[PDB]
Structures are given as C-alpha cells and as structure tokens.
Amino acid sequence: YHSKQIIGIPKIIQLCDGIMASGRKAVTHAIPALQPIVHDLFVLRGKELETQKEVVVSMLLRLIQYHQVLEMFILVLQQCHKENEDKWKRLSRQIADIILPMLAKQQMHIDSHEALGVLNTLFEILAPSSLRPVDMLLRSMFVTPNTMASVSTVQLWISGILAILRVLISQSTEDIVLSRIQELSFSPYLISCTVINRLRDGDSTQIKNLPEETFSRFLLQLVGILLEDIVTKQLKVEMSEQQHTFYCQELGTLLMCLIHIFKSGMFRRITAAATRLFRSDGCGGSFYTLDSLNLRARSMITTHPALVLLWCQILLLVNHTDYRWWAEVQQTPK
Amino acid sequence: TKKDRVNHCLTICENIVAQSVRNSPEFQKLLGIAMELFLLCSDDAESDVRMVADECLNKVIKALMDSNLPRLQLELYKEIKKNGAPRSLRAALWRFAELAHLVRPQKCRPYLVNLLPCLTRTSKRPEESVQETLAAAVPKIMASFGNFANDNEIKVLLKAFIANLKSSSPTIRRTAAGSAVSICQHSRRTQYFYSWLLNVLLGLLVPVEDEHSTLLILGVLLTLRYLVPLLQQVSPSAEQLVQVYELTLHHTQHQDHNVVTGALELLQQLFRTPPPELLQTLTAVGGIGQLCRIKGDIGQSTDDDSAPLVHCVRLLSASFLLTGGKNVLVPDRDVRVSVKALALSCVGAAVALHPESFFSKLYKVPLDTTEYPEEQYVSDILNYIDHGDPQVRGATAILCGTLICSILSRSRFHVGDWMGTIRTLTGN
C-alpha cells in the first residue's frame, strides 16, 4: 500500500494459529487454512523466510495425525530435497521419530484407503537414512492394540502395520530385517490366538525360533484377524459400510504383500518359514491353523470373489495343492 | 371504507418500492409506517383487504431485502414483541423467521436475547393457528440464533415447550414436541441437550406402573419420535436409550388406540434409524438383561437367552396381528387397520435387523393344547397379503420383501446353512 504492507506473513500464521488453538475441527478449519500457507512459503518463494518456515513446520507437527497434513509434509520434503540436501535428512529424521511411535499407539488417522495411500508415499519421500536402522521400524510394527473389540481400532492397528510392512519389503532387505528381529526379542506369541481372544473382549493387560518364523507367524495372524471379522460382523450393527470396504482393502493389500514376498524370491528365508508354518498345526490352538483360515476363506466365495482368488494364489505359493480346498473353489464334479 | 383501504394500502405499498432514494432519514420513518400499517391491515374482517395486505407486504420486503433488511427485521420484531391479534402475530412471525438467516452475526446475540421472551410468550397462545405458525418459526429461528444461546437460555426455552406436552390440542402438542427437539438440535452443546431432554422426557413417564395423563403420554411419545433420528450420531447412553425402548413397548399395550398409534409410530422410528448404542443391545443375545389380547407367555424384554428383538416381534404379532389359532386373522373391530398396518411396519423393520425373530413361535411357552391344538408361528402374519384394505396388503409385501434381503445378507448368501438351523431351532 504505497511502500506499506497491509498484512504480513507472521500475522497470517498467527491467525491460523488462533483457529487451530480453539475448539474448531482441524480437518475443516486448521488444515484448509494451512494449505495455502505452506504452498506459498515452500513451493514458490534467507533470514526471515526460514524462521517462518520452521514455525509453519512446527504447526504441521501438531496436526501430523491427519493425512491431509501428511500431504503437506510431502510437499515440504520434496521442496527441501532440492534446495538443501542436509536439511532434507534432518527433517525426515524428525518426522520419522514422531509418526513411528504414533503408529504403534494407533494415534494416526489412517483408517481409510486415501489416508493409508498418502502415508505410503510419505515413507518413500522420506530420506532413506531416516529409516535405515530398522530397529525403530520393527519396534513400532510388532505391537498390539489397546483392544480389538472396536472396528476402528482394529483397522487403525492393521493400517499402521501395513504401512511399516511395505517399507520393510521395499526400502530394506530380508537379510537386514531378519537380523534385527533376532537381536530385538520379538516373540511370535505377540498376537497369538490367546491374546486375540483377550483383546477382543476389551482387556488391555521356549525354543530359539528363527526370526523368519516369527515374521511369518505375525503376518499370518493378521490374515486370520481380517478374515475372522470380515464374515463374523453384522454390516449395519457392528461395522459400517465404509468400515467393511476398508476391511477388504486392508486384506487385499496384505495378501498382495504376502504374494510379493513369496513370488519375488528376495525373501527366501521368510517364504521357507511361511511355507513350513502353513503346514503346521496351531501349537495346540495358540495360532491360526491353515484349516481354520480356509474355513473363513471359503465363506467369502459368495461375497468377496476377488479376495478369495488372492488367497488361492497364496495357497499355491506355499505348495498347498490339497484338493480339500481346490475341488471346492473349482467345483470339480464328483 | 373497504375499497378505500385497499387502494390506500396499495398506494403506500408502491410508494415505498418505487422510491429512488432509500437512504434518506425521512424514508426510514416512512418504511416504519407502511410495515406497521400492513401488519395492522393483516388483521381485517374482509378476506380481500387481508389478502392484498399480505400479498404486497412481502413484495416490499423482497424489494427492500437487499438494502433495508435490518430495518425490516426490526420492524417485524416489534409486532412479535407485542402479543396482539392472532392474524397480525402470525403474519409477523412467519415473515421474521424466513429472514432470520440473513441476520449478520453481529446482531445475533442481541436479537436472540430479545427473542427469548417472545418465543416463550407465543408458546402460551391457545390459538391453533398461532401454534402452527410458531411450530415452523422455531427451527428457522434456532438454525441461525441457536449457536448464540447460553447454556441456561436453552433450558428456559425447553421448559417452556415441555409444559405444553400435556395440552389437549394436538396442534399445541405437535408444536411443543417439534420445537423442543429443534431447540436441542440447533445449540452449541447438541449432544449434552439431547441427553438433558431425553432424561426430562423419561422422567415424565419413567414410573410406568404409575398413572399418567393420556395427553401427556401422547406428547412425550411424539417428542421422542422426533428426537430419535437425531440420535443416530455428556452423550445419550445405552441405559436411557433402553428405557425409551421399554417405555415404547409398554405403551403399545395401552387401552387407548391413540396411545398405541403413537407408541407404534415411535417404535418403527426406533427401528428405521436405530441409534448404534441401542442397536447392539437389541441384537445381542444377552441384550437388555445384561445391563387383541396376549393370551400366553411370549417372553420378556429382559430375557437372557434370546435377543430382545425376538420378544418385540412376538409382542407385536400377539397384540395386533395374530390370535392363538393358525391362519386366523385378527378381527378388524378389535384392532383397526391403522394399527395393523403400523404393526406390520414395525415387524418388518425389526426383522431387517434380526431376521431370526420372524421364524420364532408366537408364544414362548405353549398355551392350552385343547382350545388351540396346533402352535402358531409369527410367520402367519404373511396371511395379511389378502387383507381387505390396500395399506395392510402393501405393508405385508414390504414386510417379507425385506425378509428376503435380510436373510440373504445375514446368511452371506448361504441360505441352506442358515435356514437349516432356524428350521431346527424354532421348528418353523
């Protein structure tokens, strides 16, 4: 205004700060206010600009549980990648040290296809050095939820596992992942069927097994959990219509991840252990057995043909050519 | 004088609109005279003079809405402030409520504070025409002024309409029921006031074994019917949401068909849009127990061996649809077609949630085997597809047209497996 400024950037941050520091919803008020701010400061713009940038980043960290903010951090990280390589590494480490504990405590709002998809690309955009020691990645994955009597908590718990699982099988190697699972005393009985039944009520309370045995046991239990509550859950009573389709989407990507592990050949030790575990009884009911898994999968034929075929592909990857399951899906005449 | 007044009103009515300068101070007074005259002219013996006064009163509003609304809202509020004739009060009330959403937030708290006594006083007007206009005005006023209200100001308005639930006039009762629910809906603490209103409504009738006025029961049940759809997501709890269900079930056995009709209408509303907290209780085996005449034992709502919806379906069929004999339609002189059609709607909605309730026997414990040698099932209600009136025939078609959808969905399209156990469990 003739050498006079009408409104300054710091005043705009303060106005956004007041909105986000009140009882208004962050999805409809705080996030839409931040979006033009971080797109202006970062995408298109030495001493004062940096301080505003760090203040905005600090505000984003307080709303990091929302996937809309996660996209904003992707934009910030992408811009930071080009300008200053060193700043990209430090920012990625700061984000990784925050979201990963939140994934363990189910504090991130990733209970949807869109939110989980956004979080997947954030992990790729992050600096590889922020996730190279997979000790923290594994520690936030091999966890248990507060309770499994709530559909949202189960989906949130599984959603966080899927995001970390994808990082392990893409940005790391089988040799690295299994070795750290050996050093960190992770047990296959973390989510065993005894624990599953306890958690489904709502209560929040051996031989030297190879790490590939516990990794395959952990993934197989989630398959049983998703299969159990996809068919034993009233649609209008227990879950919702959005919670039902996300259950199948969560199962679809989990079976997809299992197929890649077995098919690629980059996870030989995991596949060998998983093939052996599919052929073993559930240690006296402590773990889901293959017969129990097939019973829950046979029921989905009339409702979810897409997921049954994914389960059929997995059964071939572990050489389960028994006609007890194949003569029924194929409807072989007798 | 009749023809003069119509021409006199029109001449002023066109003078205001056809004036070029609308900002002159003399015009502001002139606007306050025409609006006052039209509202006074809205109360006339002749319909012609009343109709033209009404007709161009909103035409001067529409022309002046863009620029002179704050004065128009103020002028219309003065007529509401004074409790005058019903004709002049309704004319200024439905007009003001229409333009309430154009009031800027600055002049919202001052308007609401001044409007609190006006809405309370209007609730005491015995005229059915006034209560009809006030019924539609409250949701329009509260949708704009509600979020500017204090915690105890909502209570004052709520208690004003609650006292109108025992009135003899159905129009007064309906106005009170709709306004009270709408007041809670358009408030800052929407969920807190839903519990507060729900607790107050229950307290008016929670001693079911005591004596209550028929008018009071009709008013409270109507209020609960309006409140139920808004409870579908301090918050309303399972304990009080169950008490409403028990209150609804008990009043279906009332001797007055008006109370039965009101209870049945709320019962189907509880099933069309069931709150999630109540829905799990109704479909659980433990259910409530965890936390024309009925001749025999049908069970209890608090049974610990079957879902509460099983007993509800049994209660509806034994009371309004089925006798103890097979293929014996209940006579129309005992319970009318309206109750029969309403009962079948409730059964179909209940079946949509718990299809197993449709296949149960009518009576939990078989009655005397001499008078009724063969046991009758709830499925005999499908014989109403041949009823004499079209509403009961249509409700029966909807009833097990919904049963087809519910059985296939619940069974996950394994009908032989699902129907195999229901045939063994109930014998149907």
UniProtKB/Swiss-Prot annotation, chain B:
HEAT repeats lie at residues 110-147, 152-189. It comes from the Eukaryota. The modification N6-acetyllysine is found at K82, K140. Transmembrane segments: none annotated. Expressed in the brain cortex (at protein level). Widely expressed with the highest level of expression in the brain (nerve fibers, varicosities, and nerve endings). In the brain, the regions where it can be mainly found are the cerebellar cortex, the neocortex, the striatum, and the hippocampal formation. The N-terminal Gln-rich and Pro-rich domain has great conformational flexibility and is likely to exist in a fluctuating equilibrium of alpha-helical, random coil, and extended conformations. Belongs to the huntingtin family. It is linked to Huntington disease: A neurodegenerative disorder characterized by involuntary movements (chorea), general motor impairment, psychiatric disorders and dementia. Onset of the disease occurs usually in the third or fourth decade of life. Onset and clinical course depend on the degree of poly-Gln repeat expansion, longer expansions resulting in earlier onset and more severe clinical manifestations. Neuropathology of Huntington disease displays a distinctive pattern with loss of neurons, especially in the caudate and putamen. Lopes-Maciel-Rodan syndrome: An autosomal recessive neurodevelopmental disorder characterized by developmental regression in infancy, delayed psychomotor development, severe intellectual disability, and cerebral and cerebellar atrophy. Additional features include swallowing problems, dystonia, bradykinesia, and continuous manual stereotypies without chorea. Some patients manifest seizures. Interacts with PFN1. Interacts through its N-terminus with PRPF40A. Interacts with PQBP1. Interacts with SETD2. Interacts with SH3GLB1. Interacts with SYVN. Interacts with TPR; the interaction is inhibited by forms of Huntingtin with expanded polyglutamine stretch. Interacts with ZDHHC13 (via ANK repeats). Interacts with ZDHHC17 (via ANK repeats). Interacts with F8A1/F8A2/F8A3. Found in a complex with F8A1/F8A2/F8A3, HTT and RAB5A; mediates the recruitment of HTT by RAB5A. This is Huntingtin. It comes from Homo sapiens (Human). The chain holds residues 95 to 800 of 3142 of the full protein.
